[PDB]
Design a protein around this ligand. Sequence first.
Ligand SMILES: CCCCCCCCCCCCCCCCCC(=O)OC[C@H](COP(=O)([O-])OCC[N+](C)(C)C)OC(=O)CCCCCCCCCCCCCCCCC
Lengths: 192, 30, 59, 90, 99, 488, 53, 323, 99, 39
Amino acid sequence: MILSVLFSLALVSGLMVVRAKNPVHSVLFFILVFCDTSGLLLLLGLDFFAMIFLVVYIGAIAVLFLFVVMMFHIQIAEIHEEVLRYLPVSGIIGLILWWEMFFILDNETIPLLPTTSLIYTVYAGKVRSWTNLETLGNLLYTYYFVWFLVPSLILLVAMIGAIVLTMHRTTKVKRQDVFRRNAIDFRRTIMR
Amino acid sequence: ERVSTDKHRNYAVVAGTITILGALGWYLKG
Amino acid sequence: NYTNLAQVHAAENSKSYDEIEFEKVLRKKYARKDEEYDSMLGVVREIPPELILPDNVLP
Amino acid sequence: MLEFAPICIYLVISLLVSLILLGLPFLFFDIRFYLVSILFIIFDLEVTFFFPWAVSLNKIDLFGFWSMMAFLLILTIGFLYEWKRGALDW
Amino acid sequence: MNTDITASTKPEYPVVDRNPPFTKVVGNFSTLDYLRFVTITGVSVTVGYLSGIKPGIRGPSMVTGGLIGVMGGFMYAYQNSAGRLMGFFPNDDEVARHN
Amino acid sequence: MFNLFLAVYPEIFIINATFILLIHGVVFSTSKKYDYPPLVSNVGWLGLLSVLITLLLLAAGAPLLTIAHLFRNNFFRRDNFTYFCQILLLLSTAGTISMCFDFFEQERFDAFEFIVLILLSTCSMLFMISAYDLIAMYLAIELQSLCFYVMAASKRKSEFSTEAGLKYLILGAFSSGILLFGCSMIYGSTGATHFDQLAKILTGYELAGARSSGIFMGILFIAVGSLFKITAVPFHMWAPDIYEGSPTPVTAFLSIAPKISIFANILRVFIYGSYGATLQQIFCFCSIASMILGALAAMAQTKVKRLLAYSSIGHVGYICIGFSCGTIEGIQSLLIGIFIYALMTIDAFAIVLALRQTRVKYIADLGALAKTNPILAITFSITMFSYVGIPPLAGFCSKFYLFFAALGCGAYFLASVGVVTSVIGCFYYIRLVKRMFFDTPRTWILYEPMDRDKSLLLAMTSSFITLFFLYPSPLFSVTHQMALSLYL
Amino acid sequence: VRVASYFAMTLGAFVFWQSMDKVHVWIALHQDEKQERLEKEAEIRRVREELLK
Amino acid sequence: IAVPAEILGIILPLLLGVAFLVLAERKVMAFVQRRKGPDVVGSFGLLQPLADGLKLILKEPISPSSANFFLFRMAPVATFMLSLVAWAVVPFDYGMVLSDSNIGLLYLFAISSLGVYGIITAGWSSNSKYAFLGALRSAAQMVSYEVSIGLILITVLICVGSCNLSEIVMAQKQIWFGIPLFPVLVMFFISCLAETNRAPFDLPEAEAESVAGYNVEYSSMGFALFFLGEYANMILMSGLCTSLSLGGWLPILDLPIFKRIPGSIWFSIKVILFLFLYIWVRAAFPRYRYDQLMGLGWKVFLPLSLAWVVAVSGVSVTFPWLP
Amino acid sequence: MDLIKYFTFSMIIFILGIWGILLNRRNILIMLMSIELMLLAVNSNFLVFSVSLDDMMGQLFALLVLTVAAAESAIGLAIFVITFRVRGTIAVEFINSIQ
Amino acid sequence: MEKLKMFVVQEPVVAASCLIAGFGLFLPAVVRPILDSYQ
Ligand SMILES: CCCCCCCCCCCCCCCCCC(=O)OC[C@H](COP(=O)([O-])OCC[N+](C)(C)C)OC(=O)CCCCCCCCCCCCCCCCC
């Protein structure tokens, strides 16, 4: 029930992202759907992944989108189009994708119909319960270090591109210097 | 009066002669 | 106007080897300019007075 | 989990008290911000990678420690690029 | 952390040692490996000098080329020495020395 | 350096050289002691040197790249196929770096970050060619994608460059999302990410059935992503616009280098792992569309860069017929076609950069070139005829061997469509040759001479193209060995 | 006011998700019949192949 | 059930503590400045927070009508939620936690990350562009110093194997981590000073100066909620400082006379010293320019935090000193 | 049932991103947002598949996809900023100079 | 040496961070193998 409420809220927030008139409202509903996905991760049991979704998606990427959207100051009728015309094609494509989801579910993943009393508890792996954070760190830093070092190159490329694209140093503006003599030693002087 | 006063150019010439000697030795020993 | 042009020509033609080489280097380096990288760096790259032709001979 | 239900109830109660506090009186451009945000993204990813490494230093050996050091060195070169280019200045 | 040195293709020459130490591989450097290192470093320094004339940084360009060439030449010499010492290359001289 | 890393000396050296070049360029370009020198030429020369050195490392250490087979098996596997693919990729990168030097000085494009991104993207393509997993594949693809985003949008104030960067951005992100969904579907329905595990699970059972519907969808979405990466007509709409908008060195690099890496990746993920007739049918349809619409659209084009983009799309369609046959001869034909197309594209873009001095934009601009620059006119006409597939030149070798693979393929429809397209698409190459040689325009566009860096490369490439029919045995044997070594 | 509309859309999404649960239950129930249909079709193909051979 | 009772017993005393914290800030600043703070509203001014709150409640509200009424009203609500839910995890003694999350540190880091949205929306929803610019500046400053704070958290996480504050303190049992990492504690204190826009790095409170702030347009209760959120965050980060670098509910030297004190008293005392340090630094120092503080955050504290992370990791890995 | 619900939600989010791209013709930032929604759906699918299959590869690759998505968002917003500065507007009809 | 002293004066914080990072990398690079050999 809580799962159903959570992804109902997520679907509504995503629909508001799609059909929101104001891009700022779009960013806010994007934040909301990220929060709902984090709640779904709590339900799944991936506390670390939910927290990092919050930190990165909610924090970093979403403040980036918010900053750029607000700083643009986009006006209406500059980004504005009637949605009724595209409703048939959107419905057809969504129906095709939903039918494909139907076919995928109908064969591989069969839902279970009603259980708790039949749960066999091993008790062997519970003596030292490894957390998701702990297991992920162990694996990612011992035995998959290449797939961890490669994203460092991706981040370096992103930083280099961001600088080479959005850098503009002031051509002629004075910059304060604190290393002056009066700041360093300041020998006292008089009129005499 | 009979000396080249460019340190960088002198180092470059030394490196070029070293390169030529190394390439010749590599060819002879290969 | 031709007196002024003669002054410019004499000033250009009375240069020794060192001045010719220096002005050739300056002209080659200032022949073409990039404004994107100059703006990124925070530089202007002003034309030197050596290559500034006197206004007496300019339209 | 089983510990985030108190967090959810705390959030609900915080909403209630904030709404009550609001309703009590009723009874009576610039690229520097973008660059800062990009640096935020990069260093959030850095800290996100630090967290599991810091937790699992006891299991990962010098191999893991030096892998993290190489990751930092790859990303610290980017920080030197930031410093020398002028992205850290305002 | 477990590490395996086994290669997919079998060496075509007798193997002095499968996983020689770094110091042993460095000490295995023959005159040919030194010539490799010297030639690569000199090529890099010359290229750096010839390319840094236009920007105006000849010393800095030679320094950068020197670091790049030292790294590349040392990597190439170490590669050749290790390939010889693991039997991947015609290691007649150190096979005779081992025998 | 512990002995496992013998398997990654080329990549490690190229990464360290990229870092050193970045540090040197920044520290001596932000220097007030000098006049803030344009370090693009120096950094490019040092990057070309680094590319040559890592090429030498990879070539000489042929058996040492296999060291630590099981240790690296999680991330990548190296063999003769990857060895030759990486050799060709390094050669193409070196040629692209060498032939774009004169663009820097004349066009004032003095950002050494371009060369830094060249090196980083080349390392990404190296990792991609070596890659043997669904994770390293995605990481390398995304690394080159970000590099190419920055490359296309490199000219900040240029409206064309910004628009091309935005378009390539959005469409590449869409393709990355689709490919990611495919990887997710395969992982969920298979339990495996390593290519060996996928092969073990998938062999013996067709992908068209009630079982493994999720596997089929994942494979199809990954194929869609790869097809976008190679500009097939169902997903080609980015190639012409970004190829035109991005600076000419950027579009030359985009047309030359990513093709071989993406196609080697496709061979290693599809021909080995998910080999099944449905994938070859998908690529058959994609090849039909690619050839037909490339010819049709290039007939209507009047700009050199757009015509080159559509020619690239058509030749990708031919590489796709070679793939969609998917046999030993089919894969050998694919490799032959990739090599020949890379050589011809290097030739054509070297000539274009040579004509970039006077800012050539339209096909008519190179009119009356048979008088001002005769030998250049003959060279470019030879390149155009090679693109056509005229026998004495190199392009025809790949052409007829693709058609032979298609005749032994059983795909008579595919071969007939390909040959009809070859006849149809000859017209715009012939129009180029007419513009150089036949027309007598009222006014002529005089073109400045070349640089030696482009001239030597152009002479070597033209000699290779013209005189390839005298000795194709080395390339044919190498490609046959690569195709055989794909499996055993 | 948009808060009421947002909550109405939330209730609509909840109803849609209960409908999705209903169709999932329907698919879980009606799977065996599809299985015998597929078995009959496979038997038809096998008989056709053996008659061709 | 008992969970709402515990939540109310955490929330209401937190509001009382925030009120008496602003009163204590006034008193300490006045005593620093050779004067006496609020002393006329009740004995020693103890009823001054009550009088201020009652006046704020009784003040008639005004509606800016900024065409963003919902976002204008809900931003202080958002920051108040964030402060409270951040306080939902901080321990006070052995077993005084609501959610004993194994990822408590990252939870607090995430909540601190979410804190910028209230100010950003407050600045945007306001009609004036000065408030929007001030909100952007404050958001960026909190961003930089939260990056630094996260690096300090990583240092502490290197020191202690676990990620929950209670087990962090149980490891603090020996040496309090402040003796080994006093410079790290100092950097964390300055970073949290710049995180809450308090002491130096005080942009929004420089209203008399040209920077203005994001609270200019806000009415009585909006301003009150923003102030309550800021001061609750101040107390929260003082508690974080004492749980990270002072051992939380742990006595000094483990003497048996010191163990008679419950331990919650110890945590409260340490938090009080940290709040006194907050007011001390605010009263004793001038404030930084925006560019100066941003450059200091991105060039002085980030490299030092990375270097300290590396140094602590190297010390712990080399020797058997690892948990 | 839980796996069915999670997979259905992820597929619905993917379709919703597709719908965002479809409907937002004159809006480009929302197209990028729909792409990011596709990325989020992919991450959720990987995480739920890892949980269901008791394998850690899904978590590793979801973390890597998060890093890549953050980097590509940084690059994309850089492109957006430079484009908007070049042409002074974000309207699509000003980004149709190539045809 | 003189240039190093000038740099340390002009930028003390970066020099301190570099020294701390150098110590942190130096402990496991040398002292850790030394202790491993000693054990
Ligand atoms: C026991 C059953 C009880 C009843 C249950 C059903 C209740 C009704 C559910 C449908 C929604 C009704 C309210 C719609 C309000 C729209 C307001 C509007 O124009 O907003 C503008 C916004 C655009 O933003 P905007 O910026 O223009 O906002 C302006 C908002 N107003 C008008 C209030 C000022 O439109 C949208 O966002 C598009 C919404 C489309 C409809 C989405 C509905 C929710 C999802 C439904 C899924 C399918 C449900 C049925 C399933 C059946 C079984 C398969």
